Write a protein that binds this ligand. Structure first.
Ligand code: HG
Ligand code: ZN
Length: 256
């Protein structure tokens, strides 16, 4: 099954998931000079005040922070979006060194990491129905770079010893995702996909222009995680990012 190594990596995924070479695949390079400021775009609404996290899981490709999504509690609205999208989970992709790690790129510049906050369109009733829909999902993408530590991230950095290997989860209630955002909500937006199999083309991507900075020591602990399951030989969880995919004449819009 799919991974990020030589043999099961991003190059291979088209074999089980043909949409891997589809028409609206993610991530992409964001060429700042080609993106159009779009005046028909509403303000963005991230209402993460009443977020109910439940747990952190190592699924063997990343770790997921999972939220209670059966009421309108942590929701994205506005910008390119029609209606309400509920936060289901968040996770990151990161590199082996600071010069790589992000999935999206800005003028071919790769960031040390990248955060995804994943949301589903309410009206479809559940996350499973939503993924079968062209407007089923909304993902907030936030770049990370190395500098000063992000204090809103340390809670996550500190539970990661508990979830070293695939399968493991800890309780992770009462986490506030508002502590992961940068100060500006300027974003680029385009129609796109999930970045891991099954690569469903169900995502409106909202990618923030302003990176968050984390510490060398923060990202070092991401790199101490394992892809493998307990009692298997050690495969460091690093470089779990898909590279930039062909834009195929979709237009990336800037909110700014
Ligand atoms: Hg879809
Ligand atoms: Zn992701």
């Amino acid at each position: 099954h799919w991974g990020y190594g030589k043999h099961n990596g991003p190059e291979h995924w088209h074999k089980d998931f043909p949409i891997a070479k589809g028409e609206r695949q993610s991530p992409v390079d964001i060429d700042t000079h080609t993106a159009k400021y779009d005046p028909s775009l509403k303000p963005l609404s991230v209402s993460y005040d009443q977020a109910t996290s439940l747990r952190i899981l190592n699924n063997g490709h990343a770790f997921n922070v999972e939220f209670d999504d059966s009421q309108d509690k942590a929701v994205l609205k506005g910008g390119p979006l029609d209606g309400t999208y509920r936060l289901i989970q968040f996770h990151f992709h990161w590199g082996s060194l600071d010069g790589q790690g992000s999935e999206h790129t800005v003028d071919k510049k790769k960031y040390a990491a990248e955060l995804h906050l994943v949301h589903w369109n309410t009206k479809y009733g559940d996350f499973g129905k939503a993924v079968q829909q062209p407007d089923g999902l909304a993902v907030l993408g936030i770049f990370l770079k190395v500098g000063s530590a992000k204090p809103g991230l340390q809670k996550v950095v500190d539970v990661l010893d508990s979830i070293k290997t695939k399968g493991k989860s800890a309780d992770f209630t009462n986490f506030d995702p508002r502590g992961l955002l940068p100060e500006s909500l300027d974003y680029w937006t385009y129609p796109g996909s999930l970045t891991t199999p099954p690569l469903l083309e169900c995502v409106t991507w909202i990618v923030l222009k302003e990176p968050i900075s984390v510490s060398s020591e923060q990202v070092l602990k991401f790199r101490k995680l394992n892809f493998n399951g307990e009692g298997e030989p050690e495969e460091l969880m690093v470089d779990n990012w898909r590279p930039a995919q062909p834009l195929k004449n979709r237009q990336i819009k800037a909110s700014f």
